[PDB]
Amino acid sequence: FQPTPEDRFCFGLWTVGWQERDQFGEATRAPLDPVRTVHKLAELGAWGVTFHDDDLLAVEPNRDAAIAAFRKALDETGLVVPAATTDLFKHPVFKDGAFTSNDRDVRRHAIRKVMRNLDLAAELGAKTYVFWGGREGAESDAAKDVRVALDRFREAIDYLAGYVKEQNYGMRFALEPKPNEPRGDILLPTIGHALGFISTLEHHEMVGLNPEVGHEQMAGLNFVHGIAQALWQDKLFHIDLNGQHGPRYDQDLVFGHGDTKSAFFLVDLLESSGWEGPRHFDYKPGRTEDAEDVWVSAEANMRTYLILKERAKAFRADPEVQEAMRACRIEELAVPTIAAGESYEDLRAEEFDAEAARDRGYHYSRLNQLAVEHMLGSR
Amino acid sequence: FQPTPEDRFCFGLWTVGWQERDQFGEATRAPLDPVRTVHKLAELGAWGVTFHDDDLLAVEPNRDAAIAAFRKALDETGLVVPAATTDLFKHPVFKDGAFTSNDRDVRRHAIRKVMRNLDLAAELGAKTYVFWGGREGAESDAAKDVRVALDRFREAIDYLAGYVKEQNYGMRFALEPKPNEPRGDILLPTIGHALGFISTLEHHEMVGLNPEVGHEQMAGLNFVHGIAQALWQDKLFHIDLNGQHGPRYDQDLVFGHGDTKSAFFLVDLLESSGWEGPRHFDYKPGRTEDAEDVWVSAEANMRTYLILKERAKAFRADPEVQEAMRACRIEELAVPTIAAGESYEDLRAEEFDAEAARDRGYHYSRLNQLAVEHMLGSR
Amino acid sequence: FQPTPEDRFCFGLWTVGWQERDQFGEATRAPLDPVRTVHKLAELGAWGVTFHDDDLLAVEPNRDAAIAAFRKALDETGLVVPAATTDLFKHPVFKDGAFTSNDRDVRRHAIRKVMRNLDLAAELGAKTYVFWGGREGAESDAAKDVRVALDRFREAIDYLAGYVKEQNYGMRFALEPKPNEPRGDILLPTIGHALGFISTLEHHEMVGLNPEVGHEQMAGLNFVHGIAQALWQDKLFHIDLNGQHGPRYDQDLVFGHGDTKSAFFLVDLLESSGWEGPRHFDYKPGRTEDAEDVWVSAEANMRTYLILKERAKAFRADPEVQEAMRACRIEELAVPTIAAGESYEDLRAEEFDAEAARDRGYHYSRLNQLAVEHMLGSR
Amino acid sequence: FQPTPEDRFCFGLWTVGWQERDQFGEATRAPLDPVRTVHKLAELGAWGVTFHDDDLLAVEPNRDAAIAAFRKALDETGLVVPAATTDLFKHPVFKDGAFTSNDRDVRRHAIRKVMRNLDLAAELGAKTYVFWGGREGAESDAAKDVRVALDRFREAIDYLAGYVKEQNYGMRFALEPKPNEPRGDILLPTIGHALGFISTLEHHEMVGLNPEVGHEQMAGLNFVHGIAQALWQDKLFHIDLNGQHGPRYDQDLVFGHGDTKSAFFLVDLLESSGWEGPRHFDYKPGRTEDAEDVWVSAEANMRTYLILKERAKAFRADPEVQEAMRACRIEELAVPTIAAGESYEDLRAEEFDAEAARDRGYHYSRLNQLAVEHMLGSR
Ligand SMILES: [Mg+2]
Ligand SMILES: [Mg+2]
Ligand SMILES: [Mg+2]
Ligand SMILES: [Mg+2]
Ligand SMILES: [Mg+2]
Ligand SMILES: [Mg+2]
Ligand SMILES: [Mg+2]
Ligand SMILES: [Mg+2]
């Protein structure tokens, strides 16, 4: 269960570099030099790293010197930068939003900040750029008219998309939904809301999703179903893997360590679909954990993914599972409901005896049990 | 606070006619004759009624005789039928889904059942047809590949949309999202997921949403924000009003009796946007309630809406509120971030002093308090 | 992974016998003869069966004949009856509550109904009697003063406890908490609330808990922590095992098929604590499932428990895990904070350098990863 | 709606003094001098203030000078200190717990820190001392054996209770339940769990609850029902008022601004029960809000409470409401189920015709609607 380059595992600098200052307590770890993160991640088998613009400054406040030290580390290790993003949430000026601040001068500041990091991302070869609208939203319904906020959100995203097209950066945008926290409610709270928003964009073709396991689970939604819809619409441009124990604060646990059963079926879907995107982890080591524990937790993300991958591969390869699937008539769902040359009257000429068929079973008990037994390594 | 025809209040037959058989107990009220519902609703000031195809049979099992008695009641009262829908969830053959049953013969049965009621809906003048995919989904991830289920869901909806176009019925379709119950997870679980799905339809122009207060709240989402996005995309084709106390079983309370503050801001948004759709109630009187209580609860829906409407009208008309809104700079959100003749270099030529502006306040405390005081009738 | 009598697995008649009529659809399975359930469960390795009084009537409406057929089946198989309970929730007269109905004649009916089944339970050798107050509660705050409802709840439970003492039945009572459903909120909504209530009872010594995995999880609570507190107070008199996917309707999935990670740690705690109670399953096979699927799902409960038991046994036996636990200083939590002969001034004479110790790590990353790897059968 | 001393309104220093640094951003307000808070709160009509030990140091790092400046402000204003508490959650040494840290030296540090502030609280006349175990818990099940953690929790609380008895401080302890945040799960997660824990204490008589509106609502529980049980057990020693929008991060909104309907019924219960405790607010002004907004938000807490108090007083005084309550037979719940001289055979001699009574209604529709109409100020 050792990670390989083909696994395309990657981490944000802000994950292993998180200082673990929470709502009720001080930081428990010192700032981590991104240069050390790049070397330690490379040594563990990570293929790539991602960053917010300001992550580069964790120990070096001079932006030019911080960028140079980052690139030197990437040169020495061969670590790739598949994606980058903007910090539009820490600085107090974004307290009311970034792209959707009431204050026009703040909105323009946000756009300019992204443009500078778009420039840097392209030079590093990042072909995907992530947008998490963490400050876009409100704590009360009177504070923000969401129709007008979406006007400004659409305006910012389409403006930036036209910018990258003018520069011929060849990049795609990935919107990261989140239902709440730090805002009482965040705009585009789920995979679905972001998909609906994307379809109104002038530049819709180059905008897709960066769904996060824990974010959809904060709303109690099924992450596997959401990823299925993202794949179905060809909008899975990025993914963020972690763990979460349902609707509460964003926990950012190690992938597989929240809803493990859902993680098993997520890996099953990613692998079986042949999705070729990076397996990116957006997690926090934990406030109990020291500097050495950090690398244990980074390894744990990749190892858990690899174990679940083997379990899911064995699950689908098992003749007992393929037999159970046929008993459930799962493959019959792929047959079109309507035939190619079939008219409305052709359809209404056929009848169905619903009373003869009312006692059909679908035998998911067997398939469900084989799935669980495979996950637990007992088959 | 007496309802008028312009209020466009309507009820489904299945709401006041619910027998109150739940997961753990028998029915507490006898079947209600739809003819009596039409007369009692008309007497209370309702403008319209809606129905599932099979609702018409509550006391009369002969479909032709049940339709005739329904139409006679509608004739005598002047009650309108703005919308109709299909029962694709009670009969055991739909236990695995209707449009997304594994069994092709069940999928075709579902389509034919809808087509018959589309025919009847058009004759009654319903110009909106509602689809709640209550059986579409699964209790376990192994049971249903959602990519393939969405293929079949899209296929059914587009097929039916082409049917109504061929018949020149002039109707629009309204998809009703729901996150769970009766299925462990339902396909298209939120307003967002349905919007994303609609955008892939061949007949996307004639398909929109029927969001339900309690359904989005079962996922902890902000119903006012979701309706705002539906309005923003011009997809609010129908609405279902009721109450809910967050993530639990679907409660179907009287509108305003769950999250009252959210109901206040929902009415504020519906009225201020000028949305002209019907105010439809999808609720249950309650298992403690007898046949007479039923009509008290129906009146309570309309009365609560009307009180909240007056409170929201007074809220926006208050000079103190308009002053607070200006202090918050709410109106400045409507100013485009980017000017019409502004280039990228024009934008990057301007700078922003983020440190000079870090202590700006937005003064939502005052606006929030005026909103609450208006809701509570104290202003 | 074959069940043995020492595993003490048991099922309620209402679990495998559930007809799968839900809030939105008809029953999909026919009534199941309890006689057949007793034989089929015995054949699968179940050790015991439990029942509501009225479960015995599923196919035989004559109570005396139904009891006789039940006892004959138990005689032939050697199946034990460790516990019994009362149906105080199906009949319409309980629509407002049973012990806490406003109507005094309903409260007295409830008490008499329990007394009759207490009599039958004793004859069958049940030494634990379960109380699920499923109708005790309200949908609105105005409907039920909970202080007065708890007066009546306490009165009923203490009255019944004195009855069983007068009869020398030697039984204990197990209160089953549930946060909601079918009521908007149920009285004694969690393990905690039931413990607090029990401590006010005259007969507190003979009253404890029947916690259910899915019930605490409907409130987002940690079932393992709750069982730990129940064990800590010596009040775990019964347990109900199933699965649930967080806050939504009560799902009654196969044990281990909801939050599998929590199920792993629950089995770890039950086994390591040496708790000797029965492992009772309160689940539903599923509405997609036919009569044959039912027994697959019953077997699946016991098999999943047994696999998790082996994984947890291997987890604790692993020297790597014991080493990780020592690194975390887990065993040091068992050392009393205060020594036996230590005064307040002795304690205040010692000082602690909090700044020297601020960077201590607890190394849960390693222990967490070993736990997950053991659950997944990879160690 | 102007606050008076009899309203007993109070605020923690940490509420209006919160700097609004959250999980994703910097502080937006400067540290607030507690001296200014005492004067500004007094001017607004607050009756009291409470504090964590370390709150006194917000602008003055010398503890003796900070205490002296605090007491001078209290002298000048006549503001009372009804309660105090300990910061056992900010400092990194508490990252694994305070009373339930694995490390014995940390547990003893926690106890000594509380003892010093118990000493100061007594001098200020605080007769209630609050314990929020915010760091007591875990993010994973392997990290903390809750049985052993509760041993140490009980040990600390009983030790401290014996200390205050030895000193003759005459104070009572108030345990503050919270389900999660900052820990994945917190020990004693609800009102119920704390009540059960209290009943095992040697010093149980002097230990009760400090329930917080938003904390129970984070678990989806009914705060009014929980307060009812606390009152019923005579354990409501303190209360914390704020607002929350269901299961998500702890929001700390202005009281009445989350679940307003529940706040209405909470005020109804507090006032009608005659509970004489302080009405304490534990809230945050909001990250959008500046130094002046802070006092608007403090006033808003008291004003919202007072408006709801008037609405609830008018509700109960309304003859229409008393008539509706009688129709519901609410008063009949107060009649004991069993008569004083009634034997088991006397009870079993009476019979109940359940079929004659199955169609009784309870008419909560009318009472519910009158309650909502009163809350909205329309009666
Ligand atoms: Mg996150
Ligand atoms: Mg992320
Ligand atoms: Mg509903
Ligand atoms: Mg509906
Ligand atoms: Mg259950
Ligand atoms: Mg149960
Ligand atoms: Mg709080
Ligand atoms: Mg508090």
From TrEMBL, chains A, B, C, D:
Keywords: Isomerase, Metal-binding
Residues that coordinate or bind Mg(2+) 2: 212, 250, 252
Broad class of enzyme this protein falls into: isomerase
Residues where Mg(2+) 1 binds: 176, 212, 240, 282
Enzyme Commission code: 5.3.1.5
Designated name of the protein: Xylose isomerase
UniProt organism field: Streptomyces sp. F-1
Recorded name of the encoding gene: xylA_2
